[PDB]
Amino acid sequence: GAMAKEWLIFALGTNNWQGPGQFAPGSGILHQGQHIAMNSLEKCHCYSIWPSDLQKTPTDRDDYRVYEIPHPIPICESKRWHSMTDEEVTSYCDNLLKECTDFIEYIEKKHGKRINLFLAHHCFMNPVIMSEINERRVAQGIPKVPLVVFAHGTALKMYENEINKLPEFPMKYYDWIRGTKNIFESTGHVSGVFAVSAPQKNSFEKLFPLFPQERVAITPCGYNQLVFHRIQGMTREKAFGHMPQALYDGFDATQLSPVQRHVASDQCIPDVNAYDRVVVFCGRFAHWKRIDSVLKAASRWEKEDKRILTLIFGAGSQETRKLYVDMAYQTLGLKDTFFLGPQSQPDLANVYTVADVSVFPSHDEPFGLVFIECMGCGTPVIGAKSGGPLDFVNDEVGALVDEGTNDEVAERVYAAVKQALAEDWKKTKGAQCEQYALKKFSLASQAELMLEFVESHFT
Ligand SMILES: O=c1ccn([C@@H]2O[C@H](COP(=O)(O)OP(=O)(O)O[C@H]3O[C@H](CO)[C@@H](O)[C@H](O)[C@H]3O)[C@@H](O)[C@H]2O)c(=O)[nH]1
Numbered sequence: 001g002a003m004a005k006e007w008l009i010f011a012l013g014t015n016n017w018q019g020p021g022q023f024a025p026g027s028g029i030l031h032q033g034q035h036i037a038m039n040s041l042e043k044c045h046c047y048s049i050w051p052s053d054l055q056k057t058p059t060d061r062d063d064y065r066v067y068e069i070p071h072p073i074p075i076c077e078s079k080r081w082h083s084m085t086d087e088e089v090t091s092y093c094d095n096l097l098k099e100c101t102d103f104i105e106y107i108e109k110k111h112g113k114r115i116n117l118f119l120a121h122h123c124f125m126n127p128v129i130m131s132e133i134n135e136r137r138v139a140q141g142i143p144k145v146p147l148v149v150f151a152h153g154t155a156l157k158m159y160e161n162e163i164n165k166l167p168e169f170p171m172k173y174y175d176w177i178r179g180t181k182n183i184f185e186s187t188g189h190v191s192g193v194f195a196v197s198a199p200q201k202n203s204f205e206k207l208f209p210l211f212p213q214e215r216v217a218i219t220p221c222g223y224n225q226l227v228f229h230r231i232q233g234m235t236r237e238k239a240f241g242h243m244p245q246a247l248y249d250g251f252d253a254t255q256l257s258p259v260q261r262h263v264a265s266d267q268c269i270p271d272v273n274a275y276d277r278v279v280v281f282c283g284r285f286a287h288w289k290r291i292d293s294v295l296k297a298a299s300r301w302e303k304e305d306k307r308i309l310t311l312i313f314g315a316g317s318q319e320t321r322k323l324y325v326d327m328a329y330q331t332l333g334l335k336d337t338f339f340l341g342p343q344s345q346p347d348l349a350n351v352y353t354v355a356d357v358s359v360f361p362s363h364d365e366p367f368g369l370v371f372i373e374c375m376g377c378g379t380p381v382i383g384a385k386s387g388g389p390l391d392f393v394n395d396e397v398g399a400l401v402d403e404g405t406n407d408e409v410a411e412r413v414y415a416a417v418k419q420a421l422a423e424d425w426k427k428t429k430g431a432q433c434e435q436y437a438l439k440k441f442s443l444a445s446q447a448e449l450m451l452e453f454v455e456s457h458f459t
């Protein structure tokens with residue numbers, strides 16, 4: 001070959017990117033990372049479209065557009081796809097198709113060159129739309145463009161709910177996407193599927209058994225090292241000293257003991273420099289993140305009076321916030337553990353930078369972006385021996401505790417933190433953490449591999 005492959009990519013997302021007034025789910029963070037990654041590669045341009053009922057399509061950038069919609073993004077499980085009416089499902093898909101074809105028109109005029117990769121997120125309406133966009137192009141005498149799908153799992157779970165005839169999931173999509181659209185019944189529409197985790201690859205392969213397993217693979221995932229790096233001059237007071245406690249609406253401070261009076265809604269953490277060491281969790285408040293294992297480990301170490309400060313970052317519904325706030329303060333008597341809410345990526349880099357250790361004791365973490373972000377800031381990590389972290393957490397960058405009940409994990413997390421603090425892992429592994437993360441997991445290295453994989457195995 002005389003020249004390197006030039007890529008011109010169009011990427012259709014399911015969720016919003018992270019911006020003002022709207023935090024993004026894992027899926028939307030990944031899409032945004034990938035967009036960043038691919039516009040870094042030498043012979044490569046990526047254009048993206050994604051939906052939001054709040055964020056507005058930009059005025060001074062052309063590299064992405066927002067599909068501005070009148071109601072919250074439909075969820076597989078505010079309103080659900082199965083709750084929508086046909087006319088509403090139809091016009092959501094039809095209007096999005098139109099905005100895609102118009103963006104594609106603009107892109108191909110700007111470059112005097114045809115798009116040569118479609119990327120579609122989730123195994124539902126986005127590959128249906130890009131599949132129809134391809135058929136329309138062939139009919140017009142335009143070359144078709146390989147289509148690659150990112151299985152994140154939410155659409156696959158919805159299909160299983162239809163198959164097992166759960167009540168609020170009458171069969172409406174799975175049989176249609178296999179029997180009428182035939183999206184995954186061959187390689188005629190979709191060239192390859194990237195799954196974020198092994199259970200999603202397994203679930204995809206069971207739900208779409210006519211799709212060649214050779215064309216199914218696990219997504220290489222990167223982190224944004226432009227944002228997640230050791231932050232020069234950072235301080236505890238700058239990093240989290242001005243973040244207010246984020247509890248839940250209607251939280252009653254009178255139900256708390258006197259030694260807990262520092263716990264207060266919308267108040268900052270008092271005198272952050274008095275604490276000896278800082279332990280950080282970050283994650284959405286899902287049950288499999290095992291936040292309760294973090295809170296139980298802290299119940300033990302807070303009894304030892306070593307001034308260990310524990311920070312819980314991440315979002316939850318009012319229900320899950322009440323569960324873990326009340327668990328922390330009424331059930332376990334914590335007083336040096338605080339909830340600080342969801343935060344921007346730059347704010348988290350500052351926190352990781354000043355943390356002694358992070359703990360993410362997930363049960364079957366799909367990949368574990370939080371792990372790589374934290375290490376990329378020069379901080380060690382403690383997780384569990386399940387899911388994605390098994391593949392990349394070793395003893396030089398932190399530790400994975402043995403799987404078990406939530407109570408067993410809690411005791412093992414307590415032992416791991418006590419040992420990280422005693423041996424000052426921050427000092428002895430910190431540098432290795434940033435170098436490991438930077439070299440194996442940067443956004444641009446991982447996208448490069450991904451595209452080489454598309455060319456080697458998805459033709
Ligand atoms: O307050 C927060 C919390 C999270 N994040 C970002 O969101 C990412 C993921 O956080 P997480 O709580 O794990 O959300 P999930 O939706 O559960 O992430 C899913 O999606 C990721 C990318 O596909 C995978 O790495 C995860 O394992 C998978 O669970 C973080 O790494 C951060 O980049 C923020 O920016 N602010």
Ligand SMILES: [Mg+2]
Pocket residue numbers: 122123124150151152153154155156
């Ligand atoms: Mg999916």
